[PDB]
């Protein structure tokens, strides 16, 4: 393992949603062993975003999960080479997003992760919560981690809290591919809890916070 308790984050995201192109960059940092990260985002091309910013935030690194010793940590072993993930996000009204992230060490040697993120979304109804920007936050969640074909899969049932109560459900299916041979975990869970801690009125500037911890289910 090549991970410090204090680490930086740099990221660039390039995407379109319902055809609307956009670019976002972010500088942040976090504590890989506490499972905590912060990031400051800026919409550098394509703002104000027509859609709810919340659909983006999950694309903005499972290195930042506090793993107990008794569970193998696919992610912390993948470095310095890194890993990537690819994800699908099926919303219950037919809307869907794919996203990919390639995560590696900054080439200058320093304590920083570089993230290359692609994000694409189609079929959101013009009148649904995403297009109408009526989302409040993602609820905390529990991702389920298991192995297939010698790589790691994680599936989570996600839910957006809507304005005036009510939830809007989304199913995630992620694949994690380490850039080198690493020890493979047994079935386990990761609790996540992510929230937007600050944003300007049109979400051109957004600060994001996640806390994440792994476990192996009820005794």
């Amino acid at each position: 393992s090549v991970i410090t308790s204090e680490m930086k984050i740099e990221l660039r995201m390039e995407g379109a949603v319902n055809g609307h192109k956009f670019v976002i960059t972010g500088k942040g940092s976090g504590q890989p062993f506490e499972g905590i990260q912060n990031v400051d985002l800026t919409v550098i091309e394509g703002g104000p975003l027509p859609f709810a910013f919340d659909i983006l935030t999950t694309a903005f690194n499972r290195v930042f999960v506090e793993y107990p010793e008794e569970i193998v940590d696919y992610f912390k072993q993948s470095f310095p080479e890194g890993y990537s993930w690819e994800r699908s996000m099926s919303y219950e009204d037919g809307g869907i997003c794919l996203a990919t992230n390639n995560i590696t060490m900054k080439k200058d040697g320093s304590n920083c992760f570089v993230n290359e993120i692609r994000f694409d979304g189609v079929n959101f109804p013009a009148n649904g919560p995403v297009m109408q920007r009526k989302t409040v936050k993602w609820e905390p969640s529990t991702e389920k981690m298991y192995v297939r074909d010698g790589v790691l899969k994680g599936d989570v049932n996600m839910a957006l809290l809507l304005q005036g109560g009510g939830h809007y459900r989304c199913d995630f299916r992620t694949t994690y591919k380490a850039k080198k041979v690493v020890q493979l975990p047994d079935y386990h869970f990761v609790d996540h809890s992510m929230e937007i801690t600050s944003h300007d009125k049109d979400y051109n500037k957004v600060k994001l916070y996640e806390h994440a911890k792994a476990h192996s289910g009820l005794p």
Copy 2:
């Protein structure tokens, strides 16, 4: 609330899977405040079952969940009238099951739940783990509970451990309908951990155990 710490369970299940009809009955008991239940099942019609018994076990009562005080307990408030649920189970190879349970107090006044269960499954490939009986157990899981249309919904990502490693994924979507007006909870989670503790060779006699506890996600 009309619930004792010690309570009996009686149940009858009637179903077909890939057209193969069957009847199962069960006597058991559990501790509604500890979130623990036991049941003894018998296949009284249609045995030996062509398919994996594991697909059945989740149909064999969210009253048996240990709820903390800070979370509203939809289920324990529904009694003595009871509640019902309806569920769908989407397996990743195309196989799918629906099930329903009507839960009420035994009519003789005693400390016993009566369960009327219907179970139907179609489209399991002749060569998949279910038809080939290659399942080992359901992994522990975390159901996600939220309200819609004044009733309670719970969705869980389930996974069967297969012989020689490997998992076989299933998505649950349950609806819970209390038979009277009850206080409605906020979004929360229920950890489940269920296992077959004993069975004869052809699964005509099976003993089942679940432990279940509610919580509200990572601090």
Copy 3:
């Protein structure tokens, strides 16, 4: 050797529940297997008036009644007299879902009657959706896609209910067909369906149903 006449009878019994609501329905009808046409008269004998839209049932009420061109292998007409069965799932877009099965054999008295043992199960329809609120008009005509897997026949169709005051409510079908004996297996092909309720009393306790169905192999590549 096929055992099918151009005139054939249909007898059926359907037993189900939808959102927990139990019901039984029987039906007498007849059809013309080579023209791909069938008629049936249904009676709700237990559980009526039905809380849900009758439309969600009608598709469970036999692919023998499809007009097959000679150049397409007919899985169904070869399966007789032994018959076949099917299993189906029906995924509605609002989360509602139904499974159904049918076991189809020749009436035991030797006459030219198909006997249909049908089971039907529906869960998770929103209290306020078109199905529970009974706001459906009809199924649009459709094209089922037939293909082989694991030595049996699969057919998947995009279905759509027309709602009151326009608008459609989508459903995805996934059916499996299992012949009771070894039969010659078809290439990828299509079945057009067009089914409608031709008559019903106010509460749908009595319903007459009509389907016309024809197989084909998709648009010619040349103009």
Copy 4:
């Protein structure tokens, strides 16, 4: 007023990634909008040889090229000169999934050319599935189901790739069509498609593609 000639050109640029693998593809072709026929020549200009089956791309490479009978409203031919765009999702049965978009307008120099700006994105294809292992033969012909929602056009089709050594690999399409201006909206109808790769070099850097497409309104109820 429609602005469509019977002879029309096609220019396109597609930019994507699949399983993270970036690529660019451009194409020159032409078609006959009233016969429902189109041709295109594709070049992989960046990212070749492609690790994945080229077949998963070809459907992104214009519903103007459908022969519409007079009795069916043609959403697409009315949308011009301004054009329309579509967004699509493609759900493969092994978990693989692709989204794509196309923005279709008239070439700015006034000539009779459609310009297509296409984006394509694919994730979660198993390393060992037909797509990554390049084991596809062709898409079977299909019937798309067209219906209206929220004042735009939706079309959903059950697609199927024929694999090497028989067997099919299913995919569900869900497309949305958005005209760039107010146009008359159609009733529920169908489009038959039949598309094939007519020519390619060994690594699919160069591919010629042909589609024939015709609309209809489903099997007559009468024999």
